[PDB]
Symmetry: C5
Subunit: 287 residues, 5 copies
């Protein structure tokens, strides 16, 4: 028995089904308890700190001073962006939640009247607080205690500390408008990667769409709030030239503002106004 | 219970089914309202500007002057072409429409008498205008306001502005025939990538066929109208050596002409004459 | 409701089913009309010229003279072989036909008495003539008119013309036996990639098996007749040191001979003698 | 007959199903006999030693002294991390078990009262002992007897021994807290890769999720107990500057402690407390 | 009609099903006739010679003397290992058989009493002889006659011959124990790649698992008997410094011994003793 024409399948969907899946995934978040949501947020912040530690080491390897005289920072930023996007798989496969992707899904669930306003506020607040706690706890308990980013003062050995120092100094000397714009550019890629895993239901789609999206915002110099929380806190721990005021006021607050603006307004409102009738037709056919 | 011979599947189709899917996807566009189509076009232009900002930064990293003395522009153009093709996934997963892919699908729907001429004209006009608006709005509100491409005048720091300046000067000193030929070569790859996502219905097919196609036209020096709108407008904003007349007359108008010629004539008419009887047999079996 | 053991699938087949699919795909070609087959052949030659233009530009970028003093031609040939294999996807997704893959499938359909001899001759002749016409038409109307491979005489700018010149001079100074052997080595990879897309029915199989096969013959220095038609004609257009006699007699005729020998004899006759009883059992079970 | 809308599939699952699959896979381990479990553990340790030999050779190739003066150790560590992750596929496709992944699955099966404490202890002990035996047996019978890492004393030829020596000296001069932190960071990636293969049921998911995870911990400098057993034993065999006391007390014992802490506590307890009600609902619906 | 939860699939299997598939695939080989098996073995040896020619050219490109002064042999061996693993797809998609993978499957079919001893001996003998004949016939009729590896005596042009000469001299100066150990390390990867294609039934699994496995043994310096037959015979043809006695006694005989030992004993006996009861339960449920 020979097979000539096998069964035709597909693992992709259209934009209407992807919007409906996004609204359903966003409205499922408001039904968990506070401790379940908090533990998920802490785990996701810890995974972000894990992959950003691995990225800092992989980038600081290519920040060797003789190579840095020839190529500058190009290979270090490329290898950082190459090895960072596994954090998306770490978060999605454990079922945890991060604030940056929530700014689209839970907000569009709020637009479709699936989540009330107080439930929306507590979901976003618990998500941001738990992501912060997981990021700083990985920054101290693994990254600081392993001594990987310690200043060792010799130029042929200090490329890990020098890469962390130069990255932390670069992302702390923007103005307010510049940091808001870079954070907007980051969270558009992040929410699009959430749309990618809601659309493409295979392992190849999951791995490589979010690989190219997360690598793309990483090499662009765009600003991610949870990654910046980890990076600026481990920079403050190992005594980089930045200040606590510089890290929290000059980077973290406009990064939070720009990430929320890109999630809730730049992407959430146009997609809601494009696809709300399809969610209406989906909800009427279930009655 | 052990499985020795699993169920045989396929996620690909033939050329006849791919043509029929292209005509159906093209004729669905003329049934949306004007504001739905306009919002989709603005979102697609914004995504093009997003990924082209990320590509300009990733390419300008490898345009460092000591590396530029050794390798020229090769690594910068390669890294640009590597990080650009995620815009296709950004456009297809949100259900938005871009003019360059529309020049094949809506035109072959017009050839098969599925779209009237006035509907075809308003679909193409609204698509081009919305793509323009989204591209210039990302060029100003993110790219210009973040200061990423500002001339900083020091040769060890100015590689982002110098890469944008050299790219903008290169794509503005073609003659008319040269720019039309390069735009034809671009839109053939673009419409083939649209055929790829109409044929290969997995995440791997979606990601990597359009990766290789879009990278291929990006490294070839071929001219894309929406990408050129973003690039020449952000070049005009940060005071590159190009002129407004040079950008709009010497590049953008022959790029528009060559892109439409490749979409509607070079690819649309041969595929229509090859496969119109299969669309006839498909439409007769639905009666 | 939780899923622990999902449905077991497969997207691959055995050698018997792959042979039967090859004979069926080969015998479908003799039932198209002459103009349908001619338009498909012209489109496939045009796609080959498209991807070979993109490969020549991508390779000539890494043929920069300061990099060429250090690495030679290695990175240019690697980047050429990296960016060439998208032509296979361009040909298969539009349903067009190229002569090199036809030398296996239509010949094994002739061995199984599915195609008569005159039908076989007109299919192969129309395929070769249309592939030639599409290749030279892309060489003139896009590649020559865009000025991408023009001799500009300055050594820091002339790397595109110099790469085309050195490639065209290398593939024109073989003897007859050497060119026949390299063409045999090329068409074995080409017909194996046709077997790969007949066996592996996903997007990942389609993209990456023919990626590794086509990259493998491209970096090996093996000779492809349609790619050589494009390359030697664009080399003759931009006034490379080669002669018309050298291009047509010293390369193109032994490349045609070696490609047909590898398709019809080296691969077609052993696979026919191995698997003809399985095609007999397949054809008897349909009665 | 044309197919326009194929059958929609998925090869991924949610976090609840992934937790349930993890608990089931962990509780299946306590039902094998002692010799079956011992042979599986010996095979897995042998596969780890195989892929780490291949990684040491691939890394020592790029540790050539003239390249080492320019780039340092960056390309060697990158090529090591590139070629190491095939060990995961070697272990999963033969059905063998490694201690590092067991510290999550069997421990969460113990938390859900599926495994008794004495059965848990003998499973973990037999796993660790067999993994040790397989690693040292590959270190002697293949790696030492092939002479690949012998000190040959000439600086242009000694890059394999020098890479093994520098790696072994680097991972033996940590303090206790540093080694525990790096081992925690390793086993979080390892247990996440186990979650990846429990979630993504295709070949692409299997290959590339664990590729990016295992490459990520390899380039980060994180400490894996079985890989360190192989590496420090082959370093002791070929007379690297390290001591037996240094290898066993300064690296192997805190690596074992940190790997068990990351598997059982950092990842097992939060996932258990998040998802134990879903395992309760799964187990009640089977009655 | 919108799809929210598609049908859950999987393309992977467990270790028991993979063992059963291996025993069935191994016992199918003893039912072919002698000429069918001989033609399959000759085709597989020819494919090995094809991909090893392409690998020798791709590696000798990066063996350019100015690059060789900086990086040594690292990039040449990496590019060789990158472009070699397409031979596995060439062999599996045509249904042919190679000796190295047969040493596991046919031997475990012999352990399960599915193949008699004389049938086992003639299958292994015909496989080895046909693989030899195909390898030497490709070495002469394509590789030698194309002149690609001819000594041209000028150091800026002789990198192909110099790469072949240095590889052939390296793999001929091992002792007996060293060559046996390296051959064992090779055939473990080869038989694991056979297990990979028996387990992962997609195109992505087929391409990339055997890509990473075959690249891993290629960059490790492990010894493959059929690849060494091709390489040492083309080295003897183009007058490399090696001798016929050195090639056949110092490399080929211990490579054959180590490959058979790794296939039949190191991997076949533990997997047989682990999984023979599952094959018993599979065979009893078919009665
Ligand atoms: C559906 O499961 C998920 C998975 C990922 C995210 C997410 O937010 C990811 C990022 O933000 C990120 F990609 F930038 C990084 F991981 F790097 F931090 C999420 O919100 C939900
Ligand atoms: C079916 O959904 C789509 C997706 C993409 C396009 C498209 O046109 C894409 C480009 O033009 C592009 F690839 F060049 C880039 F994205 F880079 F701009 C489209 O028309 C329709
Ligand atoms: C089944 O659809 C196809 C697809 C491709 C070919 C083919 O022949 C391809 C080449 O020859 C090639 F790979 F070398 C290149 F594309 F580069 F030219 C074919 O014959 C039929
Ligand atoms: C389900 O089958 C498996 C597969 C792999 C592991 C495992 O533990 C793997 C590692 O630890 C590793 F990735 F670090 C390396 F392989 F490199 F050693 C396991 O526990 C169970
Ligand atoms: C099931 O179909 C197959 C496919 C491949 C092999 C095989 O043996 C492959 C190698 O040995 C190899 F990977 F090393 C190379 F191909 F490179 F030679 C086999 O035995 C059977």
């Amino acid at each position: 028995k020979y097979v000539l024409d096998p069964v035709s399948i597909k693992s992709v969907c259209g934009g209407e089904e992807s919007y409906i899946r996004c609204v359903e995934y966003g409205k499922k978040k408001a039904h968990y308890s506070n401790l379940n949501l908090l533990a998920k947020a802490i785990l996701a912040g810890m995974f972000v700190g894990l992959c950003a530690h691995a990225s800092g080491i992989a980038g600081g390897l290519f920040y060797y001073h003789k190579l840095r005289e020839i190529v500058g920072a190009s290979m270090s930023v490329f290898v950082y962006g190459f090895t960072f996007p596994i954090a998306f798989m770490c978060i999605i496969c454990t079922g945890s939640d991060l604030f940056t992707g929530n700014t689209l899904a839970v907000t569009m669930a709020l637009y479709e009247k699936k989540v009330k306003l107080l439930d929306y506020l507590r979901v976003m607040t618990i998500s941001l607080f738990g992501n912060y706690v997981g990021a700083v706890s990985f920054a101290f308990f693994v990254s600081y205690l392993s001594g990987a980013f310690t200043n060792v003062h010799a130029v042929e050995k200090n490329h890990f500390f020098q890469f962390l120092n130069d990255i932390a100094e670069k992302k702390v000397h923007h103005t307010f408008v510049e940091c808001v714009s870079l954070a907007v550019g980051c969270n558009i890629f992040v929410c699009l990667a959430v749309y990618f895993v809601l659309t493409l239901k295979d392992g190849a789609g999951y791995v490589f769409s979010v690989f190219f999206a997360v690598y793309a915002f990483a090499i662009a110099g765009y600003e991610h709030i949870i990654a910046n929380i980890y990076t600026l806190n481990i920079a403050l721990m190992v005594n980089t030239k930045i200040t606590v005021y510089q890290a929290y006021i000059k980077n973290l607050l406009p990064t939070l503002l720009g990430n929320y603006i890109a999630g809730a307004i730049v992407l959430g409102l146009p997609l809601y106004f494009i696809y709300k009738e399809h969610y209406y037709n989906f909800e009427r056919s279930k009655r």
